[PDB]
């Protein structure tokens, strides 16, 4: 969760305009699991 906040900060300046967030993050990501 601390990474969620920190990476939100580190990737919001990439967009710096339009993108509530929900699933349309300012970064690219997919989850791999068990």
């Amino acid at each position: 969760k601390k990474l969620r906040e920190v990476l939100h900060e580190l990737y919001k300046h990439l967009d710096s305009s339009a993108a509530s967030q929900q699933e349309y993050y300012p970064y690219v990501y997919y989850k791999i699991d068990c």
Binding site: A18, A19, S20, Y24
Partner: peptide
């Protein structure tokens, strides 16, 4: 050719953002 869809200031700042984000 731009085609104009009209909405009555229902949620332009939100669903217009959503249109930008999905299309």
């Amino acid at each position: 050719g731009f085609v104009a869809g009209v909405i009555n200031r229902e949620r332009i700042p939100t669903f217009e953002r959503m249109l930008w984000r999905v299309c």
